């Protein structure tokens with residue numbers, strides 16, 4: 176036995192779904208085996224992308240051109256630093272950026 | 288599960304996969320001895336109230352449908368167990384006062 | 385599983401729990417939010433850097449030794465000796481399951497390696513914005529000037545401070 | 552940047568996801584509390600008026616006892632998540648108050664406390680059941696590679712910058728502030744003398760201009 | 770998260786936020802279900 180989780184995009188986009196059977200092998204149940212369980216209906220892709228629908232154990236799913244794909248999520252673009260003992264990197268130009276940060280403050284004063 | 292006709296993008300746990308059994312295995316030790324319940328119920332003489340008899344019965348098979356189909360019993364109230372689901376069970380020891 | 389925990393494999397018991405409303409649903413949803421939260425908290429405590437920085441093969445850090453904190457390539461998992469020391473000192477059928485984390489130990493170690501490499505090679509500039517390469521002696525000169533100590537102290541006692549740091 | 556903020560807030564409706572999640576959690580808790588009234592909790596009917604109209608008190612008391620037992624358990628459970636949710640709401644409100652006090656009313660030198668980059672100021676905005684901060688930050692854009700040295704030999708003495716780091720464009724050496732390229736002639740009014748060249752690792756040879764010498768010569 | 774953000778990505782001037790003494794810079798390390806920091810601090814030793 177094991178839990179059943181459905182991986183789907185929004186119903187506005189597509190009605191295609193991907194089914195994950197939690198913490199079981201792909202024996203009793205386009206099949207991808209993960210550490211989180213048995214994934215059926217999602218294609219396996221070598222390429223890594225940003226996580227959209229998290230699954231577990233580094234596996235994330237997304238709806239891309241169309242079918243549901245599964246991949247190991249990327250940690251970001253790799254950027255080596257040209258470090259040496261006699262080189263400095265100093266900015267020559269700057270930009271002023273405005274960012275938006277939202278924090279909840281009040282909860283609805285419900286009296287029962 | 289979401290009680291809605293529109294599902295947003297994400298993962299949702301909905302049900303639980305279970306393997307259903309198809310074979311029924313019922314096993315009891317194959318004792319062919321007839322149980323002495325007939326001697327207990329059909330004894331010629333019963334003992335007194337304070338000196339109540341106690342018959343320990345072991346190594347037998349009893350069907351208990353004789354207690355059902357006999358209409359001579361004016362008092363039959365079973366308390367701790369359902370008497371109809373008795374032939375499908377097995378017990379350690381049975382005592383008949 | 386609330387249903388399997390209370391009334392596993394019993395239709396009458398399931399019918400009785402259906403009479404009590406959605407207590408079963410409430411406790412599963414509560415554990416779903418907790419399980420999401422844990423991965424979320426891991427995300428803000430670890431994934432605060434956009435790029436994965438890697439240290440150069442040259443270890444000329446002014447005498448500062450970082451081989452004990454930097455990952456070892458020989459190991460299949462990219463972890464340090466110290467990280468292995470931490471990981472070595474830390475120690476069913478009733479419907480209870482354990483969900484694996486979204487980020488496992490390998491990408492956690494990769495995130496820590498990226499943070500360490502960015503810190504060592506750039507000071508605070510990789511967190512402020514683009515990673516700017518800085519010599520480590522000059523970086524520690526900035527840090528010493530940040531606490532009211534003149535940089536001449538570092539530039540006269542670099543060997544002593546490196547030896548004390550290694551010790 | 553403010554125009555881009557306006558465009559982003561007009562386009563992306565999911566930017567207020569935290570506030571929408573708080574509202575949705577409150578609505579779900581209230582809906583659960585409402586729907587729990589329909590449960591029998593072992594009684595023959597979930598309608599109190601139906602129980603009162605159908606049964607005499609000696610059995611109706613047992614039935615309403617089961618009903619109020621289930622209802623009080625549901626109610627105290629609901630109160631439990633209400634207190635917990637109020638706890639993280641209080642924590643978020645304390646965090647927002649600390650953020651606004653240290654970030655709007657002042658200039659916080661904490662990294663990433665007021666968004667990514669070097670913090671200049673922030674402006675709070677009213678929101679339904681929340682507050683929205685617009686963090687104005689200083690972010691570098693364009694950079695270049697330069698050759699640097701920790702100290703400079705003038706006459707065997709070690710010179711260190713009072714503020715900034717020595718840079719070189721390949722032929723000449725300059726001193727500039729740390730977060731912006733602005734090369735200046737390395738003079739005695741920019742650097743201070745401490746120690747000698749035999750101690751500093753990686754010291755180089757240059758010429759330090761003295762403004763007093765042309766004044767004395769003229 | 771606050772300790773890593775203001776202690777690894779920068780130089781905090783808060784007392785005892787990154788260990789006893791004058792904080793300079795710190796190292797984060799991976800741990801099971803946690804994070805462990807190596808705070809490098811400046812401590813005076815000999816006085817007159």
Ligand SMILES: *[C@@H]1O[C@H](CO)[C@@H](O[C@@H]2O[C@H](CO)[C@@H](O)[C@H](O)[C@H]2NC(C)=O)[C@H](O)[C@H]1NC(C)=O
Nearest residue numbers: 266267268269270271552690691692693694732
């Ligand atoms: C620094 O960058 C800014 C943009 O981020 C530059 O400003 C632009 O300069 C070009 C000239 O090449 C103009 O056509 C644009 O209209 C300017 N943009 C704005 C918003 O005014 C600026 O020139 C750069 N400065 C340096 C010294 O590189």
Ligand SMILES: *[C@@H]1O[C@H](CO)[C@@H](O[C@@H]2O[C@H](CO)[C@@H](O)[C@H](O)[C@H]2NC(C)=O)[C@H](O)[C@H]1NC(C)=O
Nearest residue numbers: 443444445446447448449450451452453465550
């Ligand atoms: C940094 O310190 C480590 C020890 O903690 C050094 O590793 C040792 O290197 C010597 C040879 O130099 C070996 O004989 C030891 O067996 C090594 N020990 C370990 C634990 O690896 C390392 O060489 C030092 N690096 C620098 C730059 O000095």
Ligand SMILES: *[C@@H]1O[C@H](CO)[C@@H](O[C@@H]2O[C@H](CO)[C@@H](O)[C@H](O)[C@H]2NC(C)=O)[C@H](O)[C@H]1NC(C)=O
Nearest residue numbers: 718719720721722723724725726734735736737
């Ligand atoms: C480094 O910067 C210096 C600035 O002082 C440059 O020197 C000037 O170069 C221009 C270009 O022909 C001349 O017109 C000036 O007379 C020079 N001034 C001095 C004081 O020498 C130098 O060319 C730059 N070098 C590089 C490689 O960029």
Ligand SMILES: *[C@@H]1O[C@H](CO)[C@@H](O[C@@H]2O[C@H](CO)[C@@H](O)[C@H](O)[C@H]2NC(C)=O)[C@H](O)[C@H]1NC(C)=O
Nearest residue numbers: 702703704705706707748752753754755756757
């Ligand atoms: C800066 O210039 C001085 C000379 O004024 C250099 O000193 C020389 O050092 C070498 C190596 O020890 C000696 O063989 C010479 O005799 C020294 N010169 C004199 C005049 O005594 C010094 O090395 C230079 N510094 C750098 C970093 O190049």
Ligand SMILES: *[C@@H]1O[C@H](CO)[C@@H](O)[C@H](O)[C@H]1NC(C)=O
Nearest residue numbers: 185186187188189293294295
């Ligand atoms: C569905 O998606 C389209 C874009 O593909 C959008 O224009 C439309 O408003 C969306 N409708 C709903 C139901 O959200």
Ligand SMILES: *[C@@H]1O[C@H](CO)[C@@H](O)[C@H](O)[C@H]1NC(C)=O
Nearest residue numbers: 199200201202208209210212
């Ligand atoms: C699944 O079962 C097969 C049976 O041969 C076994 O080899 C494999 O290791 C199992 N995998 C998992 C994920 O348990």
Ligand SMILES: *[C@@H]1O[C@H](CO)[C@@H](O)[C@H](O)[C@H]1NC(C)=O
Nearest residue numbers: 207218219220221222245246
């Ligand atoms: C990834 O590429 C290898 C070849 O290098 C191939 O054998 C493998 O099947 C590919 N996997 C996927 C999921 O495309």
Ligand SMILES: *[C@@H]1O[C@H](CO)[C@@H](O)[C@H](O)[C@H]1NC(C)=O
Nearest residue numbers: 324325326328329353354357
């Ligand atoms: C007692 O005698 C009757 C005779 O009809 C018989 O049916 C019954 O089985 C006997 N006793 C029991 C309880 O076995």
Ligand SMILES: *[C@@H]1O[C@H](CO)[C@@H](O)[C@H](O)[C@H]1NC(C)=O
Nearest residue numbers: 256257264693694695696697
């Ligand atoms: C600095 O030099 C390195 C040499 O590898 C190069 O990769 C990098 O792009 C250069 N950066 C700038 C801003 O010139």
Ligand SMILES: *[C@@H]1O[C@H](CO)[C@@H](O)[C@H](O)[C@H]1NC(C)=O
Nearest residue numbers: 259260261442444752753754
């Ligand atoms: C920097 O390291 C190189 C080794 O590649 C060495 O030759 C050079 O002298 C060093 N320079 C300084 C200033 O330490």
Ligand SMILES: *[C@@H]1O[C@H](CO)[C@@H](O)[C@H](O)[C@H]1NC(C)=O
Nearest residue numbers: 790811812813814815816817
């Ligand atoms: C300073 O002098 C006092 C006595 O006046 C003495 O107790 C103390 O140990 C001295 N401290 C040092 C650092 O010499």
